Amino acid sequence: MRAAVVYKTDGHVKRIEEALKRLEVEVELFNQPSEELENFDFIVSVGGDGTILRILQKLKRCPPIFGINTGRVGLLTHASPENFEVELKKAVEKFEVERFPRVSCSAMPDVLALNEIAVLSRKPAKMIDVALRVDGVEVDRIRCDGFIVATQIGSTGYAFSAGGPVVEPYLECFILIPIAPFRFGWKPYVVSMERKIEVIAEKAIVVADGQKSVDFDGEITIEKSEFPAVFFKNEKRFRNLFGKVRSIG
Amino acid sequence: MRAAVVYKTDGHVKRIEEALKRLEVEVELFNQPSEELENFDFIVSVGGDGTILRILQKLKRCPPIFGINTGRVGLLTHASPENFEVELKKAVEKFEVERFPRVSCSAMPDVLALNEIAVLSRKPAKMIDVALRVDGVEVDRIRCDGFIVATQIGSTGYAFSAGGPVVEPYLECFILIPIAPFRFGWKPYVVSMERKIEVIAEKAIVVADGQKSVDFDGEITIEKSEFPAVFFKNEKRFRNLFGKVRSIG
Amino acid sequence: MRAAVVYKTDGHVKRIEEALKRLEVEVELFNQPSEELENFDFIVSVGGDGTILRILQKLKRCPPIFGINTGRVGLLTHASPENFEVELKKAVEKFEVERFPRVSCSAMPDVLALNEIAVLSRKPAKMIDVALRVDGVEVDRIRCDGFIVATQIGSTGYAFSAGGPVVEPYLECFILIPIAPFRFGWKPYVVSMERKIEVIAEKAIVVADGQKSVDFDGEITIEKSEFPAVFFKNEKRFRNLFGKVRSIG
Amino acid sequence: MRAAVVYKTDGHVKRIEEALKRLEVEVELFNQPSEELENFDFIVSVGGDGTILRILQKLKRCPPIFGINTGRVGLLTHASPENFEVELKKAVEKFEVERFPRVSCSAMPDVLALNEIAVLSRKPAKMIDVALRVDGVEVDRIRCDGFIVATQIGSTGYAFSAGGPVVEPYLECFILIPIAPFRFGWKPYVVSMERKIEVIAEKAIVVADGQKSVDFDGEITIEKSEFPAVFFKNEKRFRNLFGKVRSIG
Numbered sequence A, B, C, D: 001m002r003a004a005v006v007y008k009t010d011g012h013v014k015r016i017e018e019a020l021k022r023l024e025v026e027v028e029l030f031n032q033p034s035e036e037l038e039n040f041d042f043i044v045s046v047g048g049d050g051t052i053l054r055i056l057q058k059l060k061r062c063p064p065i066f067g068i069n070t071g072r073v074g075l076l077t078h079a080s081p082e083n084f085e086v087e088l089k090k091a092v093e094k095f096e097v098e099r100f101p102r103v104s105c106s107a108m109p110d111v112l113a114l115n116e117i118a119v120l121s122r123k124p125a126k127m128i129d130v131a132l133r134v135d136g137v138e139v140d141r142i143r144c145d146g147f148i149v150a151t152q153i154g155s156t157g158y159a160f161s162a163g164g165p166v167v168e169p170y171l172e173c174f175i176l177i178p179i180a181p182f183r184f185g186w187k188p189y190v191v192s193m194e195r196k197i198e199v200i201a202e203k204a205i206v207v208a209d210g211q212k213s214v215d216f217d218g219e220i221t222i223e224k225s226e227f228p229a230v231f232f233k234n235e236k237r238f239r240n241l242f243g244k245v246r247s248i249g
């Protein structure tokens, strides 16, 4: 096997190299993500949740990712720098995998998002008027700072901050929620991920996973893609969800 | 075929009877639901969602229910008294059916809930300390007036009032949410309805769909039963959801 | 001077007695508060905020209260048992005083509330329809588990759990907020404590500071009384507020 | 007397000219605000709440404003185009006035805000780390899209959208509230307007009343100014608050 180790800072990189060596895995080192990372049997990510998002932006077909958390909460990670060698060994020897859907949006065809597509005002302190359709039906029209279309994995990201519910990783769905909605009443809406979401807004910017973005006007379609994020199975993922969420900051 | 008409007040009951009779259906009227409603091919309810919740509490096997909304929002109803005739003919002719899961709790194993199981302080104005586990993991413990375990169908009821999300009727899940939580941070949690929910509390009551209740002390488990609620297919269910929610009051 | 020591459990009571005695203060111990507490120059309470709420319910004219926190957050307390001695000496020597207004409601004209008057359904799990007027204007009508009329001091209690704002203790106002409102939009309202509040509801109870309650049907008026709560000046009150709130649980 | 009539569109301007003439008032017409508007006995504003904000940005000492609402809610306005002639006549003949505090911020010395100062990320979809101090005490540190320091008049603006309480116009205070706070728990804080607010944020933009703005880094002080907004007394202002708020969109 050949693995890619992608790191932001090189604190623990030597020990990771030595672990993968003891495991008879060939190692290539990267300090920035690239599409070349598709050419590996697996990817070791050193950093945080954000680091995994940036790696994912470079992958269409996704080799399984093992995350070592130096970041903070690490909802996407499998180990810390203190316990990684035991966890990495178990992960590669078992080689069990887990998949989470990513979505696309029509304003950025070849971009994929694990957390959310967000549609925001191009100018801060400026509202946009957002119309929401789902499978062709008009669901809402609200003036707001922006509007989030998140997966369940994204329920703990921006959607969370906007007031959304925590949804467990293994319940596939969309969370549709506004940021600073200027209306007396509003609610987050949770719908099946097999549906097609349409957002219409003038003078907007669309943003996938806080990374790639483009200005747009009018209609954008968001739908589940065929290219999921792939991670080594983290067998305590559901258990760890609720403690991690309560630590968010 | 034979139908039961269940009403609270004598609404358009003679008219509805006449419509069934022109469809070659035999009718029997019920001022109150009973277990006798199982001995019918289908059930027409005249009332609001609350009437339908009371029909269901008397049914294990559920003949498909057609709801005529005399109440308020009528998320469980199919028509108005000003248009029932046409949807009713359409329904019995096609006889297309739709099912939503019900849950039961161990404190009252024989009673089924479509909306939610709620665990409240036995004395109003007193908090209770509620511990929540899901498939055996301690997910939270929180001081509160009560705690709601709802289905997606129940996301528009008591859970909605506690601050929960609107979940579409075809996405199967539990919403777990406190009533007046005395804590700085809290979120509703949305989890798979395949999971087992455990609630532990002292000096408490348990209520199913607002209808049946009993005092309890200690652990109760809530889980998905084998006896879903059966309605005629409402083809506009998802598209109707949005305007009905905004009308909530 | 003579002081009353009121406690729930025999905490640091012998120690506290000894400290008062070295300040040339005479002491009498109270296992339960009574109207007899008016015949003292000051009152030391050993307990939490709840103990202080119970002292106050027995006082019209209020000797200044010094609180030793054995409970939880102790927004109404002055010290811990691990530091009471020093703040207590400091307090009796300077004898600087601080007052917060109390309110009364017409259902129980003789009982005063520092935190809030709460109007709840008499039966748990049942909503009540609450109409709210302020100086005679109909401000709202809403179906809910209950409705809270709090002072700024009460903004960190039941009102906080219902979703209310944190108001500093020196900004005099009412917070008006429902418990589990069954409606698409709602807000808490903050108004001048000089205004008269009218609540109308049937099949209800009214509760003052969590302590005294009575059944009522119809209109009640809540207004500012002439008998404020009197504590020794806590010089860190405002700065302490913020960390205590975040610790709420 | 000499009045300035400031309008966005000229639909009803002729009738306003004729009304002021019948009242023996000299009229000057403006289709954009300017500092020259200080030179008048009163100002008639035709447009909405936003129109009043833009006028106010050009005034240090403020002549009394009478607002004719063609906008939407009109919390700041006195009449509609259907009833203005009766209301204008009563307003000028009585000449009773009402004042609401405006605040300044140190990053824009000569700018005044009626609603709020908002401190936002310069880049959309980017959080800033905001530290909040009040009278020198550290109150909070939160990662967020932005942070609002509103007056009570602003409680129905951006602060409202971020989740803040409705505060009546005659209760002077600050509302301190984050936009999209990335934290498990948070609350709006309501404090006395006699206090000094300090916000510290890197890579921010500060915005007064959605109008004037400047990029800044580090510490900004917000405090009540000596230059209030002055309006003709609207004797139904408190009464109208609650209906207007429920109509917000």
Ligand SMILES: NC(=O)c1ccc[n+]([C@@H]2O[C@H](COP(=O)([O-])OP(=O)(O)OC[C@H]3O[C@@H](n4cnc5c(N)ncnc54)[C@H](OP(=O)(O)O)[C@@H]3O)[C@@H](O)[C@H]2O)c1
Pocket (backbone or CB within 6 Å): A047, A048, A049, A050, A051, A053, A071, A072, A073, A074, A075, A115, A116, A153, A154, A155, A156, A157, A158, A159, A161, A162, A208, A209, A210, A211, A249, D125, D126, D127, D144, D145, D179, D180, D181, D182
């Ligand atoms: N809440 C907000 O107001 C806000 C605003 C914009 C974006 N975001 C989130 O940040 C993501 C991209 O970030 P960016 O480059 O703009 O900033 P970023 O610095 O990469 O991320 C900001 C924070 O979000 C955390 N995070 C990322 N995914 C998460 C997940 N799904 N659950 C819980 N926390 C998660 C990050 O974790 P680590 O520290 O471990 O890397 C970090 O603490 C977006 O996908 C969006 O979900 C949040």
Ligand SMILES: NC(=O)c1ccc[n+]([C@@H]2O[C@H](COP(=O)([O-])OP(=O)(O)OC[C@H]3O[C@@H](n4cnc5c(N)ncnc54)[C@H](OP(=O)(O)O)[C@@H]3O)[C@@H](O)[C@H]2O)c1
Pocket (backbone or CB within 6 Å): B047, B048, B049, B050, B051, B053, B071, B072, B073, B074, B075, B115, B116, B153, B154, B155, B156, B157, B158, B159, B161, B162, B208, B209, B210, B211, C125, C126, C127, C143, C144, C145, C179, C180, C181, C182
């Ligand atoms: N929100 C609260 O503070 C609160 C408190 C107790 C109970 N409830 C809800 O009321 C239900 C029945 O309890 P009850 O007998 O005490 O009250 P109820 O009077 O029988 O019904 C309460 C109200 O909720 C509506 N409703 C019922 N199911 C709904 C659904 N899932 N989505 C949206 N609205 C729904 C009813 O509609 P109709 O007018 O058409 O009948 C009625 O107006 C419970 O299952 C619970 O969901 C809510």
Ligand SMILES: NC(=O)c1ccc[n+]([C@@H]2O[C@H](COP(=O)([O-])OP(=O)(O)OC[C@H]3O[C@@H](n4cnc5c(N)ncnc54)[C@H](OP(=O)(O)O)[C@@H]3O)[C@@H](O)[C@H]2O)c1
Pocket (backbone or CB within 6 Å): B125, B126, B127, B143, B144, B145, B179, B180, B181, B182, C047, C048, C049, C050, C051, C053, C071, C072, C073, C074, C075, C115, C116, C153, C154, C155, C156, C157, C158, C159, C161, C162, C208, C209, C210, C211
């Ligand atoms: N949040 C809810 O769901 C709910 C329900 C009922 C009552 N309450 C609150 O409890 C108070 C007393 O009622 P009770 O006898 O039923 O309960 P309690 O057990 O006497 O007190 C309830 C809890 O609230 C705390 N508390 C009291 N006043 C507070 C204040 N203004 N700010 C922050 N925390 C405060 C107490 O602190 P200590 O631990 O230090 O004593 C205690 O932990 C009421 O006035 C009401 O404010 C809240």
Ligand SMILES: NC(=O)c1ccc[n+]([C@@H]2O[C@H](COP(=O)([O-])OP(=O)(O)OC[C@H]3O[C@@H](n4cnc5c(N)ncnc54)[C@H](OP(=O)(O)O)[C@@H]3O)[C@@H](O)[C@H]2O)c1
Pocket (backbone or CB within 6 Å): A125, A126, A127, A144, A145, A179, A180, A181, A182, D047, D048, D049, D050, D051, D053, D071, D072, D073, D074, D075, D115, D116, D153, D154, D155, D156, D157, D158, D159, D161, D162, D208, D209, D210, D211, D249
């Ligand atoms: N809620 C949000 O996400 C958001 C975002 C940015 C700014 N704002 C608010 O808008 C103000 C400046 O606006 P801008 O030029 O960016 O946009 P704007 O177009 O002038 O105003 C946006 C909306 O806010 C309304 N409004 C202004 N002051 C209000 C008040 N205090 N109470 C209730 N509604 C009020 C306006 O009323 P009319 O239609 O009558 O003119 C308009 O409907 C700011 O002071 C801020 O309060 C809100």
